[PDB]
């Protein structure tokens, strides 16, 4: 009827468009279709206010976990009065990152690339020739009767030596961490079928003449040093660094310029009364493969693309406050529906891989779940997502283990492991 | 005289019933007969309010580190009125804790066990034979004049071959991190003989109608990978993994399936002129126990059972907001009252243990204090508990230390080290 | 005219007079003659009140991350009134430090020590005869016809042994963390032309009558456990402790005591007809200082002397409340202006220490800056201060990269790397 009077439509429509106009000025990007997002935290508020000549202008002031994709709740009312919208918190990102840079390939030696000489009188060359990279190996007096080149007739004389480098068979590529980690963290106020969202970051927070939100934190180190890399996933461990043939996995490295490795070869020879002698090479470097077979693979470590990105838990505390206009404001929250519609898990008791397990799960929500096992996790929570249907976790069980339990939220599920 | 008008004490009693009936009915457990608990912690505070109909609801909001055996006073009292009671906000327990795996078992090498065999003519066969776990040496052309088994009479011809694991007297017993770490917070409303009590976790802050808590926190990377544990003490530093046979503590394994050693043996061999050759074997495996020897001790660590808990200091913060209805309120503390009774240190400069110390510590209060030294210390602040007597810290003295001083809240004590 | 009715002037100073009395009262330390302060951070603020009789005490509540250099500005106003003056949260000083332990120099092999004798019958001596630390090495069966020292007529018997160890340049010093790490964090109330400032730990909270603050923190592991020295820069990386000699930086140690190596010696010799033989020995220990060659600088790491300091973006919340009275009070701030003067910068890509920029910069306030970069950086923020005109960094540049671009708050420049 009048412009002076709106109805209900009317004012809340007016509300949201004043919200969204700030924000929108305030450099927020406006998000359209999201998934549904219905929050899970509620936690103490502050209310206050200040009266302008006649008109009080109030607050509500809180604060929520930064934890990617948890939201809370405040509903917007008129003064002892009728509900009329929600704004939503909604943290919707939070992953920690850096860059690695390629250091060398490793794997299990197959073959030896050699080359030898013998001399039949004077003693082993100084130093034993070779290329950069391969090792040396020598025995003085290695003419004798019974055991000489065709004409010599040396005794206690002589010398046998060579050089060699492993040839390997490349499984793993080793990386190592090329920059500071650093906090990726958006944050969006969530309107009935609108969003507005922005990178958060420590040194500025968002502002707007009706909302602000800010970031804080402390300095994290959680991402590791040095990777290796195989089939797509991220293994962590004893690992060297490049040049280093510490006997763990990556002793032998392929890089750009050659190999490197080390150790003493396992060296000898045979005799012919008038021909050349026989090498034996059992052995070159020293190769500690066998411990990359044993590396742990993190899940919580996916590859970007070089760049490595971790899940984690709460990287801080988002504040915010909202200051509307003379309303009544109050928090509110719903526990997330969610079921683990199946469940699959394989492994062993002690094992790199542990026991794996699949989960298909269901949710009516974008949120972040406790999850729960009667095995060790690897994870505390876990983000759920309309869109995702499948998750994996890594579980350490018992080898008194004949049923794997898992809870999400508050859904359970249990399996037999596939063995 | 009348329930219309009551008195201070049965005024109390109901407030007081009220609070312990909201957090019961609201999943808090009771505990009593607790140890005295003052509280050493008040920072700011913000008071607030709203009226509904004629009547003011108040309220008070803070906040408090996440700190093992800390506590917060609050004053309840009339308007503009008289002291009622006290609600104490008490962080009762914090540790943080992951679950770990048994990999192997070491110590030095005290004996070798080996097979050798010798052959009258060929060569040294491919491979030579070994058990697994075992490794091999061998040299070619052992058949000569001089050096000869019974019979022989192989000249620069033959072999002599063997394959040897290291005998071991276990000393230190190597587990790996097999979970992710979490944190374990549980905190406390305490009123006059009686706390109510929560865990309490960054996802679900704990909500009742007069009073609210959450923790707000970060993701901790805290906890070691590797251990080495000797007589119930926990040991970090350069520690292998299992199957890695670096040259650092626990290159020579003993677990389940054997043993795993790595090396060149130091072989050679005696001659006689018509019997089989001796084998000298001085050395199997490299072994390098004696970096185990300078291991660590990590004081904060300890064995749960795996399970291992650390001590830490703050995990976080954990707010709160009390609403009892038309009071004031206000933040107090006090100072505890703690002596050192006594303190003995012993140790030396540079050591694996550094200096040790035992105090015995008397305290009015649970709580949580500085700790200072004129040596350099391995924790900042320490719990003092009622309930124990004894605590033992580790300190890094220079050279040039006669008197090891500890101060522990305001408490201070001197000793001369034992030595 | 009158003390009833002060003009502005002095009532400012009254009030200021007021705030400096308590601060210095409460044993906050006042510090004169400080660069300039001028505050980059505002975020959300409570406001809130109690009347005393008829006299409004009104306060603001805010709070600013602990982030080296970083401050807050809040504006002291009239009631519905004019400007007044300006209260500033500054903090002043954040670093992560702990005390470090000498261990051990390293550096290549430029020789060996070495004794040896021979024997022209029997075996082998058991043990091989040596001092400690050094090697051994041994053959038997040395004497032999074409072989023999003078008078000497043994056929495959008699043994040649020695001992030995290396000699190197030291090039890199090696230190252990010897203590816990702890934060040092400095906090001020800075009013015009004067300062008051406190050290601030987590377990106590600054307190005065109109100003309170506190820091809430996480306990942080953020400092190495060992690292290399050399020419007054700190590396990090393939370590070894002391005594362990993996094939990784610091396998030859030299400290108070000699030496520690380990290895199997190049050991072999040359005949003579009827003179003692001749060791020829190659290699005594294994030496890995190439790795140590590779060890990346950390320059976040700087020696303040033994303890190490460390430059880290947040450790914290810095929480604080103003109550002056019957006032308005309002956040500000202000950005920065930096200028990048110059920017040089020389290395490579994959290298240790990657590309190395040094800046001069200018700016008008102690600061904190977001630093940004085309290539990796190794920190996010960047403390500025009007007393420091040069700055270096490290960048992680790939190979396609023919400038660098460098932007320090809202500065930019770009160099040609200096090759
Ligand atoms: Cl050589
Ligand atoms: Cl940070
Ligand atoms: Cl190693
Ligand atoms: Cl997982
Ligand atoms: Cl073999
Ligand atoms: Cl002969
Ligand atoms: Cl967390
Ligand atoms: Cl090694
Ligand atoms: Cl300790
Ligand atoms: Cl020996
Ligand atoms: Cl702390
Ligand atoms: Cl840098
Ligand atoms: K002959
Ligand atoms: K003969
Ligand atoms: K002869
Ligand atoms: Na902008
Ligand atoms: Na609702
Ligand atoms: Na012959
Ligand atoms: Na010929
Ligand atoms: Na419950
Ligand atoms: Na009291
Ligand atoms: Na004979
Ligand atoms: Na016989
Ligand atoms: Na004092
Ligand atoms: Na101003
Ligand atoms: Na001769
Ligand atoms: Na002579």
């Keep these: 009827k009048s412009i002076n009077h709106p109805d209900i439509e009317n004012y809340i429509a007016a509300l949201q468009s004043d919200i969204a106009n700030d924000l929108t000025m305030h450099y927020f990007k406006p998000l359209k279709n999201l998934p549904a997002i219905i929050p899970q935290y509620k936690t103490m508020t502050l209310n206050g206010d200040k009266v302008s000549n006649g008109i009080r202008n109030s607050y509500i002031e809180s604060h929520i976990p930064a934890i990617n994709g948890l939201s809370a709740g405040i509903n917007i009312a008129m003064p002892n009065g009728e509900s009329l919208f929600s704004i939503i918190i909604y943290v919707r990102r939070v992953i920690n990152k850096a860059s690695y ?25 100084s130093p034993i020739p ?15 009767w019974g055991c000489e080149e065709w004409g010599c007739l040396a005794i206690n004389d002589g010398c046998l030596y060579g050089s060699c480098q492993d040839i390997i068979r490349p499984e793993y590529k080793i990386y190592k961490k090329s920059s500071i980690e650093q906090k990726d963290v958006e944050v969006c106020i969530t309107m009935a079928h609108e969003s507005f969202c922005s990178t958060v970051d420590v040194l500025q927070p968002l502002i707007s003449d ?11 180190d959680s991402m590791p040093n040095i990777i290796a890399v195989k089939n797509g996933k991220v293994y962590v461990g004893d690992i ?10 990556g002793s032998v490295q392929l890089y750009s310029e050659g190999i490197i ?10 005799c012919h009364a008038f021909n050349r002698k026989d090498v034996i090479l059992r052995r070159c470097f020293d190769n500690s493969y066998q411990s990359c077979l044993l590396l742990e693979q993190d899940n919580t470590l996916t590859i970007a693309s070089m760049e490595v990105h971790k899940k984690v838990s709460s990287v801080g505390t988002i504040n915010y406050k909202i200051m509307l206009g003379d309303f009544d404001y109050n928090a509110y929250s719903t526990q997330a529906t969610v079921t683990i519609d199946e469940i699959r898990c394989g492994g062993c008791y002690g094992c790199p891989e542990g026991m794996a397990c699949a989960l298909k799960l269901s ?11 009667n095995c060790d996790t690897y994870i505390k929570i876990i983000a759920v997502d309309p869109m995702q249907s499948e998750y994996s976790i890594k579980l350490n069980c018992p080898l008194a283990t004949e049923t794997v339990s898992v809870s999400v939220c508050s859904a359970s599920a249990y399996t037999k492991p596939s063995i």
């Design 363 to 373: 949710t009516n929500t974008i949120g972040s779940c406790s999850i729960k096992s």
């Design 240 to 249: 060297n660094d490049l040049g280093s043939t510490a006997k763990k996995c």
């Design 130 to 144: 070779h290329q950069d990279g391969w090792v040396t190996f020598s025995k003085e007096r290695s003419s004798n």
């Design 101 to 125: 840079r390629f250091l060398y390939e490793t794997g299990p030696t197959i073959g030896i690339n050699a080359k030898h000489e013998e001399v039949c009188t004077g003693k082993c060359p």
């Design 210 to 220: 009706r909302i602000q939100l800010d970031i804080q934190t402390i300095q994290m």
């Design 261 to 270: 490795g080390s150790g003493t070869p396992k060296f000898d020879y045979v």
